């Protein structure tokens, strides 16, 4: 995830006289030369946005060099990768008996190690571009490295979901916090509409948990995509409209919330019920409205990014046919 961070550092200055002629330009130049494109303080710095505040140029006191130093507190655009995160374009660079190595081709440089024990793997031959999902482990940010270290496997959709039991109302402050994720969702949706509809339909039919019966697309005036299975007589609700209404304090967020595999993960639909009518295989998770909203939202961002970036990477049918083996492995593992 691309976000904003604030760092503190100390820069050495070899020529204090020349440095002080233009402190802001030289400071930005040195910060970019040192920190852009590297891992530092549990993050990967993409851009140096600015310098919030600095120190005077002190002169080093414990040596006779005459050089200077300066404390800099600077704001940077960084990236952080979480567990279960979807990376739609990683290139296989080494496939041997021990491990598989991949390098993501996206705006979040991460190198992914892939175990050979799983039958999902050992099929992405060297040179192929496959989409993977990260494991439930922390992504390592070794200081000074130009990539991130992560573990993951070729993405196979899961057949299991979770139910969130909300017993706490959504506060207005929490709603004003969540409208930022709502705006991110809006941006991703409006960027998706600019892309190719056939690619969207193919890639959503491909990674749907069930098998799509036939060509049938639901349009909600904000999200457009093929329809899948239903759940008896239960009807989904748009999360975005629910949040925008909860801004006006007009809806109750309590109850049993769930996103079963029948829904399209990239769609803002969700199932809120007054009873636990979901066929969950685990105990419902008692929480508040903020927790469940954050989880479902971040899931929608994740899958929207996944689908859009999959369409961005795979632009022609030639790569589709070159990766038809991966697509067959995807299609084979679905529940009837």
Partner 1 sequence: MYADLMTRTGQVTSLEKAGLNAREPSNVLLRMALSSPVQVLTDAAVDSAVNPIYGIAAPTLMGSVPRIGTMYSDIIMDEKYITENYKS
Partner 2 sequence: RYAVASYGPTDALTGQPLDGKRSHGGLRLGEMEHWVLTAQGAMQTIIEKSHDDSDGCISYICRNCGEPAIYNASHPIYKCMNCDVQADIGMVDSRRSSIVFQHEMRAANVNITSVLSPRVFQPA
Partner 3 sequence: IVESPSICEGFVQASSQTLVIIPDNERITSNVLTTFEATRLVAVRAQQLAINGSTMLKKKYSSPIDIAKQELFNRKIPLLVMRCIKVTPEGQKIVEIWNPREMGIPLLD
Binding site for partner 2 (CB under 8 A): 8, 10, 41-42, 53-56, 60, 62-64, 71, 73, 140-144
Establish if 197 lies at the interface with partner 1 (CB under 8 A). Answer: no
Q: According to CB under 8 A, which one of 36, 58, 93, 283 is a site residue for partner 1?
A: 58
Establish if 28 lies at the interface with partner 1 (CB under 8 A). Answer: no
**Closer of 66 and 127 to partner 3 (Cβ):** 66
Instruction: For residue 139, give the nearest of 181, 116, 117, 108 by alpha carbon.
Output: 108
Give the residues across from 94 on adjacent strands. Answer: 101
Can you list the positions of beta strands (E) in the chain? 2-13, 38-39, 44-54, 58-59, 68-79, 86-95, 99-104, 111-115, 129-134, 149-154, 163-166, 217-219, 224-226, 237-238, 255-258, 269-273, 285-287
42's contact among partner 1, partner 2, partner 3, none, with CB below 5 to 8 A by partner kind, is partner 2
**Closer of 70 and 310 to partner 1 (Cβ):** 70
CA distance linking residue 28 with residue 88, whole number of Å: 33
**Closer of 16 and 157 to partner 2 (Cβ):** 16
Residues in the chain: 336
CB of 66 to partner 3, least distance (A): 3
**Closer of 74 and 271 to partner 3 (Cβ):** 74
**Closer of 4 and 55 to partner 2 (Cβ):** 55
CB of 146 to partner 2, least distance (A): 10
Q: Where are the alpha helices (DSSP H) in 168-284?
A: 172-193, 197-206, 239-247
CB of 21 to partner 3, least distance (A): 10
CA distance linking residue 262 with residue 209, whole number of Å: 7
142's contact among partner 3, partner 1, partner 2, none, with CB below 5 to 8 A by partner kind, is partner 2
State the CB neighbour count (10 A cutoff) for residue 140. Answer: 16
CB of 33 to partner 1, least distance (A): 17
CA distances for 196 relative to 108, 201, 276, 312, angstroms = 24, 9, 38, 9
14's contact among partner 2, partner 3, partner 1, none, with CB below 5 to 8 A by partner kind, is partner 3
Extract the tokens encoding 150.
Answer: 């992560």
Extract the tokens encoding 46.
Answer: 């993409």
CA distance linking residue 307 with residue 155, whole number of Å: 12
State the CB neighbour count (10 A cutoff) for residue 162. Answer: 16
CB of 10 to partner 2, least distance (A): 6
Give the residues across from 68 on adjacent strands. Answer: 13, 59
**Closer of 41 and 224 to partner 3 (Cβ):** 41
Interacting positions 44-73 with partner 3 (CB under 8 A)? 55-56, 58-59, 64-67, 71, 73
**Contact letters (x/-) for partner 1, 66-105, by CB under 8 A?**
--x-------------------------------------
CB of 16 to partner 2, least distance (A): 16
């Amino acid at each position: 995830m691309i976000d904003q961070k604030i760092f503190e550092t100390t820069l050495n200055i070899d020529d204090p006289t020349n440095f002080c002629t233009n402190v802001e330009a030289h400071l930005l130049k040195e910060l970019e030369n040192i920190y852009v494109g590297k891992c530092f303080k549990n993050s990967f710095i993409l851009n140096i946005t600015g310098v919030i505040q600095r120190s005077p140029c002190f002169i080093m006191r414990t040596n006779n060099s005459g050089r200077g130093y300066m404390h800099v507190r600077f704001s940077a655009v960084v990236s952080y990768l979480n567990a279960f995160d979807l990376i739609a374009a990683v290139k296989i660079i080494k496939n041997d008996s021990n491990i598989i190595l991949g390098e993501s081709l996206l705006t979040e440089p991460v190198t992914i190690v892939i175990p050979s024990s799983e039958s999902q793997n050992n099929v992405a031959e060297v040179g192929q571009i496959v989409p993977v999902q990260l494991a439930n482990s922390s992504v390592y940010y070794i200081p000074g490295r130009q990539q991130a270290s992560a573990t993951g496997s070729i993405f196979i959709p899961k057949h299991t979901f979770s139910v969130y039991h909300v017993q706490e109302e959504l506060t207005q402050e929490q709603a004003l916090n969540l409208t930022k994720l709502v705006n991110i969702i809006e941006m991703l949706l409006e960027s998706r509409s600019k892309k190719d509809f056939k690619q969207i339909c193919f890639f959503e039919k491909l990674y749907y948990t069930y098998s799509i019966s036939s060509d049938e697309i639901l349009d909600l005036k904000i999200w457009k995509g093929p329809k899948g299975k239903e759940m008896s007589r239960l009807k989904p609700c748009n999360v975005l409209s629910f949040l925008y209404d909860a801004l006006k304090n007009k809806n109750s967020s309590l109850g049993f919330w769930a996103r079963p595999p029948n829904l399209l993960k990239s769609s803002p639909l969700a199932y809120q019920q007054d009873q636990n009518s979901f066929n969950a295989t685990e105990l419902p998770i008692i929480c508040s409205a903020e927790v469940m909203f954050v989880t479902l939202l971040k899931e929608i961002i994740n899958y929207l990014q996944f689908i859009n970036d999959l369409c961005d990477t795979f632009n022609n049918e030639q790569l589709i046919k070159r990766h038809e083996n991966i697509w067959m492995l995807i299609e084979q593992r679905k529940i009837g």
